[PDB]
């Protein structure tokens, strides 16, 4: 355990190395774990036809963005 004690904790390390370690740890622990639900809203918005009668196509409706 003596070698483990001798191994430098974060306070001994220079500031830039600690900053990089914090960046990686923050990424892993927070940014990846942060999850939100938007798929249903996005799919519905893409599926909704946009002003087909106002659009002067004079034919079959244009394929929706999801299509």
């Amino acid at each position: 355990v003596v070698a483990c004690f001798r191994m430098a904790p974060l306070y001994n390390l220079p500031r830039h190395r600690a900053v990089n370690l914090f960046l990686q740890g923050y990424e892993k622990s927070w940014i990846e774990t942060e999850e939100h639900y938007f798929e249903d809203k996005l799919i519905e918005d893409l599926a909704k036809p946009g002003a087909e009668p106002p659009e002067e196509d004079e034919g079959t409706k244009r394929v929706d963005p999801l299509h």
């Binding site: 191994m7 904790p9 974060l10 600690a18 370690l21 740890g25 942060e34």
Partner: protein, 81 residues
């Protein structure tokens, strides 16, 4: 920059008073210094693990709240509230 600066200072302070307390407690101080024995990546992982409410991290309250506020600001900037 500033967050890790204060985190390193508080780790220094905790290391110091644990170093004082090992004399009173020999069995507990080993479990406490497992934190310092672990590699720096693992140390910063558990220091940042104060997300959610498992409350096993040694990070103090003001330091935790600072990162929570900055994360909220970053989420607002990203547009996900």
């Amino acid at each position: 920059d500033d967050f890790v600066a204060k985190l390193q200072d508080n780790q220094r302070f905790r290391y110091n008073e644990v170093m004082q307390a090992l004399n009173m407690s020999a069995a507990l101080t080993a479990r406490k210094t497992k934190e310092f024995r672990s590699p720096p990546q693992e140390q910063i992982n558990m220091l940042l693990n104060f997300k959610d409410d498992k409350s096993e991290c040694p990070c103090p309250e003001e330091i935790r709240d600072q990162l929570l506020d900055f994360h909220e600001d970053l989420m607002t900037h990203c547009g996900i509230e």
